């Protein structure tokens, strides 16, 4: 190691746009922090889920508009219909416990 080598390195670092003045291994973490995309900002993170409300609501509307046909919801429907016919329904809110 020489002073010539240290000057050469300070020059290469100042030139290529890397960190100029000597730093701790611990402080370089801030360089790393702003050199990257923070985790919570990545499309693999905030965009992870598809929007389930858009799909559900849209296909629900399209079903009511008679375009899309949902057999699963049809099943649920007829089952519930027969269930309220049988005499066991869903209690109107507030009625069930005390009565």
């Amino acid at each position: 190691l020489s002073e010539y080598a240290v000057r050469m390195s300070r020059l290469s670092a100042r030139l290529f746009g890397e960190v100029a003045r000597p730093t701790d291994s611990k402080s370089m973490k801030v360089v790393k922090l702003f050199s990257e995309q923070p985790l919570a900002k990545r499309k693999e993170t905030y965009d992870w889920y598809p929007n389930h409300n858009t799909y559900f609501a849209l296909m629900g509307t399209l079903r009511f508009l008679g375009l899309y046909r949902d057999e699963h919801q049809d099943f649920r429907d007829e089952q519930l219909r027969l269930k309220k016919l049988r005499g066991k329904g869903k209690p109107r809110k507030g009625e069930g416990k005390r009565a």
Binding site: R63, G66, R69, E71, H72, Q73, D74, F75
Partner: protein
């Protein structure tokens, strides 16, 4: 919750429980009976309870030699339709 749904065949196969182990050894009684009903039986393409009329599906494409516009039935008309179904 849309992706959480299934085919009608799968749902009936599930609810009927014909393929179970109770059916084979006669581990359950014959007086207990439940059946499968088609839920697509009385439905027509384009029909919904919102009441829309689509040129290619619900209603004929051309009325009086012209092209029918997308339209919606009256409230009471839909009441009578649902009564019929």
């Amino acid at each position: 919750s849309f992706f959480t749904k299934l085919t009608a065949d799968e749902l009936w196969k599930g609810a009927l429980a014909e393929s179970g182990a109770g059916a084979r050894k006669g581990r359950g009684k014959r007086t207990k009976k439940k059946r499968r009903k088609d839920l697509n039986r009385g439905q027509i393409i384009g029909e919904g309870r919102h009441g829309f009329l689509w040129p290619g599906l619900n209603i004929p494409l051309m009325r009086n030699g012209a092209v029918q516009t997308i339209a919606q039935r009256s409230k009471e008309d839909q009441e009578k339709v649902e009564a019929d179904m």
